[PDB]
Amino acid sequence: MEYRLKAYYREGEKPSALRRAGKLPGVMYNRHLNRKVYVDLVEFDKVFRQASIHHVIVLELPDGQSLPTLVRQVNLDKRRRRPEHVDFFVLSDEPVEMYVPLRFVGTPAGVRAGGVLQEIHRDILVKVSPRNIPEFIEVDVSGLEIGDSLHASDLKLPPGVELAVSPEETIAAVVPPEDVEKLAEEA
Amino acid sequence: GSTRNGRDSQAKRLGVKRYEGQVVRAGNILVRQRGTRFKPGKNVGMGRDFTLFALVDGVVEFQDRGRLGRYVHVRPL
Amino acid sequence: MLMPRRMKYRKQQRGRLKGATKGGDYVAFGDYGLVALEPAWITAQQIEAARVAMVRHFRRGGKIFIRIFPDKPYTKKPLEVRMGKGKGNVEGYVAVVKPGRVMFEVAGVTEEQAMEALRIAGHKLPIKTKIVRRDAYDEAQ
Amino acid sequence: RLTAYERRKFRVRNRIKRTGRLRLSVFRSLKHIYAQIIDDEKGVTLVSASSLALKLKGNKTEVARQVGRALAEKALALGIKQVAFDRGPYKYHGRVKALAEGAREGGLEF
Amino acid sequence: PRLKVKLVKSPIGYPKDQKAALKALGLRRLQQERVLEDTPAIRGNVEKVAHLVRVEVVE
RNA sequence: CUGACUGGGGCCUGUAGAGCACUGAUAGGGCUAGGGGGCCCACCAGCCUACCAAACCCUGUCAAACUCCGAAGGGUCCCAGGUGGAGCCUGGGAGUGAGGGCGCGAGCGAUAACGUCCGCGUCCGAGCGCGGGAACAACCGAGACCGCCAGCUAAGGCCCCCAAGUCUGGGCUAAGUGGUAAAGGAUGUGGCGCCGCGAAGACAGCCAGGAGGUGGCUUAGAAGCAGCCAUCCUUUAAAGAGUGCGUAAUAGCUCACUGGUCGAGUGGCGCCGCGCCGAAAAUGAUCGGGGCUUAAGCCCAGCGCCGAAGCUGCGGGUCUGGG
RNA sequence: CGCCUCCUAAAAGGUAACGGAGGCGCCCAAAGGUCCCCUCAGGCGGGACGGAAAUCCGCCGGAGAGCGCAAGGGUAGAAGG
RNA sequence: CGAUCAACGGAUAAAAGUUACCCCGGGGAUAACAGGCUGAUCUCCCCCGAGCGUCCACAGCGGCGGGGAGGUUUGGCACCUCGAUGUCGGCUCGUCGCAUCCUGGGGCUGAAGAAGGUCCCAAGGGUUGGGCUGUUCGCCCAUUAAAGCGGCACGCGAGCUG
RNA sequence: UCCCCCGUGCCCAUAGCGGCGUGGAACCACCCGUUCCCAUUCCGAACACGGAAGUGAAACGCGCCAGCGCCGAUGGUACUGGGCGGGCGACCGCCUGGGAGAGUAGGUCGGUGCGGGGGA
């Protein structure tokens, strides 16, 4: 949903300061524009968990601009698993690519039997309209068993959607569970 | 405990000997190489062992031609 | 246990361990993980001990995800031999793990089960670790 | 991707570019023969002869002789005497050899 | 511009290239000052041993 | 004038890093050869396999002897700066050719060694001359020509030993931590941020009740406290056929739950600072000692002061170069 | 114990260890020169014996083939046949 | 042109061992002892708790792994000492640490009592005699409250033995 | 002085791959024959000569398309020269300068010189 976050133009400030100053250095750009910026760390985190890449995020620039944007990418402190720079894609018109969540309706019959269910790609890749972004994509993951798998070709789509991956790309599989019963062999 | 390893041949001292923008007389070794990491070009000869050297006098001119490999040139004075 | 089925070079040099985890640093497959916190090696015995510990604590279902592998041949010489006269033998295969390395991804499990399981596995391992969750930070990576 | 035609072409022309003397490129169409002098250092065609321009006829070998002498004349008017002949992808024979004779006897050095 | 440059820390134990950079500026003892024209070469030597020396742009 | 070094410019490189385009290694999937199983089976094929398992594709990783890439740098050369116990050449004389420590980058080693072996650098060696570090060759400062009962600083200090502040402001610690060690644990403490409920009243202290058939799979005859196949609602605060004591039997307790009495925080998380345990070796102990707790500790901010053979001041000597 | 290749080896070269890997102590009268001609491996489909893999055909291929022998470098616009 | 002059810059054209019968010059440039640094090995201690323990992870236990301490073993290095630091064992004499064998105190218990197990605090005192063996060590004998483990140059030869 | 074609070259994929349409005036090519020149480890496939029946099918040329490919920012970071510290150690921070690779946006279905022939 619409997730607003104040955006400030970092001019010449050192990124270590802003990251030190609770500010997340980022940069917002498109084929038209490009601007060094920064945000609040805690703000971008709070929204961003709500506002995962799957969703528009309106940056409230200081001038009054309210940018429909998309987190194209985010840098992370590997040594801390902490965001360290944000890639703000200015979601203008002329429909663009992104990742949409997956609404896996139902539970696999095999998973109910005791198997384990793994979501291969918990998000999907689609070049869709800037203002026609379906927040979810449901799937029938109930008619499965241990060893059954789904692919990109079986997902049905809302209007104006373009699956941007291999149609044969498997995304959900039911593998045999993890059991101590097969450990006495290993004990 | 014994060892199979422990031997190594002598250092051959390969590499480029004169650089671009460097005056050279004819007959000077330009590149002491194996194979042709640099190919001979304008006023540049190459002996049997791929050794590039100045054909004429002048200045060294390295020039990479992309897919066409790295060439050397001896631009006369 | 885990060990390369073959390799171009039997022995290998020790090598520095400084720096951050290059690859495998976001929850990719499972729901929870156990990221490293200090650089260190992890032998196949330790990886295996943590694995069997996790599967036992689960004891049913769930899926374990070992995003590391012990390829580097660990080496020690025969006991009470003077230095030199060759390199020691391959005691076993370790796996280098820098900080940020997401060692373990468990999925198909309730939160508490994966949490405690990853905790026990953490105790089995020789490094301070951190249980974590798949996130948009993970989803964005 | 190449052909034995193409690979032959770059073959002979690399060989002749190697020397440094002016090159005598000789295209040979089915109905015409084109020949020119070229300075690889400059990529500039010095002298241009072409069976098409002379409007010749008869045996193609005949026209190769004629255009050979014509290019010999146009070049010798420019003082260019030593020049490397480029048979290109062609075999040095028939029409092309007729042209080469048209230049050697035409007063050209090669 | 010119450069009052006061050698304000011993170069002993530092790399010989640094010391030679000090000689390039002619500095020989502690507390030795030299006003020198700010040339990019001389400024280069100053930058090399800036940690060993104090600098003030005088003129 | 060419030196070291420096700036400009030119180019050379495959390292760190990164990456998987090569070689390998590789986790899990899709796919699926092919081999394995079951039938169908020999009349030869066909299904199923949650078997292994090519090749390939997806996601995710590794590599000193992998590289689609690729630095920082370093090398060289031209130009410029650079007059120096600089440089070059020619000769005479050498000693040295057991090195070591420290830092960094590596190998070996056990990612042990005051270890070994290399590269770059430094110091000692030869500077065990000087200040600090208590003591200590290489750790910090700094290159000892000499004298002076002069001054300014370096590191390091300014509670006494011992010179300089019981100096100033802001905090934290209560362990003498400081002034020894790890994982692990911990209502330690201080500061944070995060969420719950907070007067259609909290935690909390209490107070009062808190279930029925009774059976299911009925079976070590306990419907409920027992190995579990279960979990209809019912009784007008509604309290679950229970968490646990008696129950191969009832009990009775108590909890969740019903509200009230009190009436304001309370409840749970994550982060950080400093602390605790973890923490046992052998002649007498100790932070160098004394002692030290809004410190005389730790962190932050200052100012001032001490502080060397450093520097400056005076005088003197001596060597090179110039007059 | 001598020489070659690669890493070690820190993007110049050189660089140690009873460090990590392999080689050489030849061979070719053509495996040399030169001119001319051609371009591989591999994969798929078709093809009597005959196959996984003989020879043939078509199709896709920059080189992953080959280049006397270790490795590496080089290389088809040939050093390959 | 005659080289495994391959110890491959090739000491002769031409050459192997042994010495506890030894000797000389040197070396702590280098070994055995000890000491020293490391703690691989070792002793001990904690972490996880799989599983056991009618059941019950933790009375007792503690798979697989992890983290430590000590510096008594075997080791590594070779740092002092090779113009000398005498090396196992026994005896005499001790002194010290506690990681306590008994004696003291206590906790928990799968502690009915008694007897125990385990852990905690505790070093004041004690920790026997003998057979075998050079032995330390160990086994055994009879006991004991027990029959501790270690450091002190594996203490101690200008104290003894050999 | 502009368009087209044919030869060359340079830049070395933004230049390629793939698909799409398109060219016959001319050029080129395909193509027609093989007596000649020449040739096939067989073959006029190739090369070579004579030639012009037909065709742009192919090829080649040009224009479209980003599916692949390739190029690829900006920021940020790894890393690092240098100066500092911290850490028992593995190793880690900070100041100054440098600064990736990956990825992201985005871009590319080429540009360029020379000489000929044709046309305007």
UniProtKB/Swiss-Prot annotation, chain A:
Cellular component, GO annotation: cytosolic large ribosomal subunit
GO molecular function: 5S rRNA binding; structural constituent of ribosome
InterPro entries: Rbsml_bL25/Gln-tRNA_synth_N, Ribosomal_bL25/Gln-tRNA_synth, Ribosomal_bL25_b-dom, Ribosomal_bL25_C, Ribosomal_bL25_long, Ribosomal_L25_dom, Ribosomal_uL5_bac-type
Keyword annotations: Ribonucleoprotein, Ribosomal protein, RNA-binding, rRNA-binding
Gene3D superfamilies linked: Ribosomal protein L25, beta domain, Ribosomal Protein L25, Chain P
GO annotation terms (biological process): translation
Pfam families, A to Z: Ribosomal_L25p, Ribosomal_TL5_C
Function statement: This is one of 3 proteins that mediate the attachment of the 5S rRNA onto the large ribosomal subunit.
Family statement: Belongs to the bacterial ribosomal protein bL25 family. CTC subfamily.
Quaternary context: Part of the 50S ribosomal subunit. Contacts the 5S rRNA; has been isolated in a complex with 5S rRNA and uL5, 5S rRNA and DNA binding protein II; 5S rRNA and uL18; 5S rRNA, uL5 and DNA binding protein II.
Protein name: Large ribosomal subunit protein bL25
Highest classification ranks of the organism: Bacteria, Thermotogati, Deinococcota, Deinococci, Thermales
UniProtKB/Swiss-Prot annotation, chain B:
Region called Disordered, residue ranges: 1-14
Keywords noted in UniProt: Ribonucleoprotein, Ribosomal protein
Pfam families: Ribosomal_L27 (PF01016)
NCBIfam families in alphabetical order: L27 (TIGR00062)
Assembly and oligomerization: Part of the 50S ribosomal subunit.
GO biological process: translation
Keyword Ribonucleoprotein listed: yes
Gene3D superfamilies referenced in this protein's UniProt entry, alphabetically: 2.40.50.100
GO CC annotation terms, alphabetical: cytosolic large ribosomal subunit
InterPro entries for this protein: Ribosomal_bL27, Ribosomal_bL27_CS
Family: Belongs to the bacterial ribosomal protein bL27 family.
UniProt keyword rRNA processing, yes or no: no
Highest rank taxon of the organism: Bacteria
Function of the molecule: Found on the solvent side of the large subunit.
Protein name from the UniProt record: Large ribosomal subunit protein bL27
Swiss-Prot record, chain C:
Family assignment from sequence similarity: Belongs to the universal ribosomal protein uL16 family.
GO-annotated cellular components: cytosolic large ribosomal subunit
General function of this protein: This protein binds directly to 23S rRNA. Interacts with the A site tRNA.
Presence of the UniProt keyword Isomerase in the record: no
Organism of derivation: Thermus thermophilus (strain ATCC 27634 / DSM 579 / HB8)
Record-given protein name: Large ribosomal subunit protein uL16
Assembly information from the UniProt record: Part of the 50S ribosomal subunit.
Family matches, as InterPro entries: Ribosomal_uL16 (IPR047873), Ribosomal_uL16_bact-type (IPR000114), Ribosomal_uL16_dom (IPR016180), Ribosomal_uL16_sf (IPR036920)
UniProtKB/Swiss-Prot annotation, chain E:
Subunit text: Part of the 50S ribosomal subunit.
CDD domains: Ribosomal_L30 (cd01658)
Entry keywords, A to Z: Ribonucleoprotein, Ribosomal protein
One GO cellular component term: cytosolic large ribosomal subunit
One GO MF term: structural constituent of ribosome
Record gene name: rpmD
Gene Ontology biological process terms from the UniProt entry: translation
Superkingdom of origin organism: Bacteria
Protein name per the record: Large ribosomal subunit protein uL30
